Design an enzyme around this catalytic site. Structure first.
Site, PDB file in Angstrom:
ATOM      1  CE  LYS A   1      -4.400  -1.766   1.451  1.00  0.00           C
ATOM      2  NZ  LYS A   1      -5.544  -1.702   2.379  1.00  0.00           N
TER       3      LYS A   1
ATOM      4  NE  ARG B   1      -7.622  -8.331   0.875  1.00  0.00           N
ATOM      5  CZ  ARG B   1      -7.348  -7.508  -0.153  1.00  0.00           C
ATOM      6  NH1 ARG B   1      -6.436  -6.535  -0.053  1.00  0.00           N
ATOM      7  NH2 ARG B   1      -8.007  -7.655  -1.314  1.00  0.00           N
TER       8      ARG B   1
END
Ligand SMILES: COc1ccc(C(=O)CSc2nc3c(=O)[nH]c(N)nc3[nH]2)cc1
Ligand SMILES: COc1ccc(C(=O)CSc2nc3c(=O)[nH]c(N)nc3[nH]2)cc1
EC number: 2.5.1.15
Lengths: 272, 260
Positions: B199, B233
């Site tokens: 991210k 995740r």
């Protein structure tokens, strides 16, 4: 928390990455490797000319000096990076300091005849590492009733020994010596309880990079240990370790940035 | 001791699990990628639709998602998480073997809440909206509210999972504040699911592109797992699983089994 050496200082308000420069044309290659590690974000380079591996044979003073001193000199006169020297030998300690080394990083914690006096004489920072036995036998059958307590006691004893010899506490660093007379379970006990070693109010140095505590856990060879190595480094750094000794500098420094960003968002800047 | 139950099986949350991301023959490749992630040690596969992405019709989402869920459920033992906001997809996903409903919208679409409740499946509540007074407190308030909303609809607390939603209307310092304080979310006594893999909270800190974020992603996973996060995740399953075994060895040697 700060160290002072060779007219400069190292600020340990954030983790530092120490790149491994193993020197067991040699000189040119070693300096190119240092250069890559400095570019990748290493702020200390650790120069070592005697294998400290299980079963290792001893090297002569003359050979160690030939391997180590020209590497320390070349680095000290080209870059601004701090230099640690991985030695047990009084003469290597003296000569290293003369050509610009900043930290004495002895796996034997200055146990060799004359080492303690040589280190004191330099005025340099000294890292005290725990090892059970010596490299020839340490991994035969490591045994502790309580590994944390026994390493903790060793540091009490060695701090005193150093103070007695005229080395001030402010010069000392502590390292629990992952893989130095420890089985897998002993290593993970020390990693899990690492923050508790902060009671000495001294810098903690750790070296887990590519070691057996990763290898035996994952059942992989030495080139397959980067992820495990980063996990160890992050675990240690989240507990406030000050210097992380590694092979893979770029990846480690990136991981340390994330740790720094996390610790700076935290109120008390440490996990325990 | 924390466990989830779905589709005749259970998830043991006494240690961290790695959940591999599956991007949706297309079906043959999806099965192949699922197989690779299971072989790397993923125990949950997340099937989905990022933010910014093109919205799709119910019909298209069913055609994309249901055959994949079905094919994985027929071939593998792994748990299957479905990223959807649509009640029809929630329902049909459960019929063909999904284990966890992972709605980034936290069941805000009309009918989604009811559909999730009917399935009897575990439900992940994710915070999404950057400006906050105390980002932790806002997220924490959101959880209390959404838990209540779920319990009111007949979803037992034992089916819920909480995700603070890294990267989702959160700037750099908000993201790291939530990561630094993650362990505080344990007061709900619910599983914690986190997703930081590749991210911008890593990308921006490090100034590197999406394909150079593995080391930072691993750091984030380790930092979360050390605080007792239950499901991580990720894109890079093998490396995350290795890092988690190191975390597990560490936490097993710890009398507390958690860092705070
Ligand atoms: C393949 O398995 C390996 C075994 C060993 C290594 C090494 O790098 C061992 S030399 C070493 N370790 C330490 C340490 O922990 N602390 C300090 N202060 N100095 C150290 N010097 C690497 C890989
Ligand atoms: C390059 O910048 C990137 C931006 C976004 C990504 C994503 O994969 C985000 S989609 C997504 N995130 C979550 C999450 O955190 N938790 C849950 N529960 N579901 C999620 N679904 C990756 C890279």
């Amino acid at each position: 928390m700060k160290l002072f050496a060779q007219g400069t200082s190292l600020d340990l308000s954030h983790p530092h990455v120490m790149g491994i420069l193993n020197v067991t044309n040699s000189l040119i290659d070693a300096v190119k490797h240092a250069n890559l590690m400095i570019n990748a974000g290493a702020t200390i380079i650790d120069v070592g000319g005697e294998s400290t591996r299980p079963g290792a044979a001893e090297v002569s003073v003359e050979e160690e000096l030939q391997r180590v001193i020209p590497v320390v000199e070349a680095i000290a006169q080209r870059f601004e990076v701090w230099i640690s020297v991985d030695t047990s030998k009084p003469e290597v300690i003296r000569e290293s300091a003369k050509v610009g080394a900043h930290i004495i990083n002895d796996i034997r914690s200055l146990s060799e005849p004359g080492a303690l006096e040589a280190a004191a004489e330099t005025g340099l920072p000294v890292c005290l590492m725990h090892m059970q036995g010596n490299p020839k036998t340490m991994q035969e059958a490591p045994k502790y009733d309580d590994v944390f307590a026994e390493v903790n006691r060793y540091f009490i004893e060695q701090i005193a020994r150093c103070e007695q010899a005229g080395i001030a506490k402010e010069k000392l660093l502590l390292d629990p010596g992952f893989g130095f007379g420890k089985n897998l379970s002993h290593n993970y006990s020390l990693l899990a309880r690492l923050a508790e070693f902060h009671h000495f109010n001294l810098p903690l140095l750790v070296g887990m990079s590519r070691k057996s505590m990763i290898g035996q856990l994952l059942n992989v060879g030495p080139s397959e240990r980067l992820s495990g190595s980063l996990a160890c480094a992050v675990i240690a750094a989240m507990q406030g370790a000050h210097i992380i000794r590694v092979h893979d500098v770029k990846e480690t420094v990136e991981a340390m940035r994330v740790v720094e960003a996390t610790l700076s968002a935290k109120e008390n800047k440490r996990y325990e």
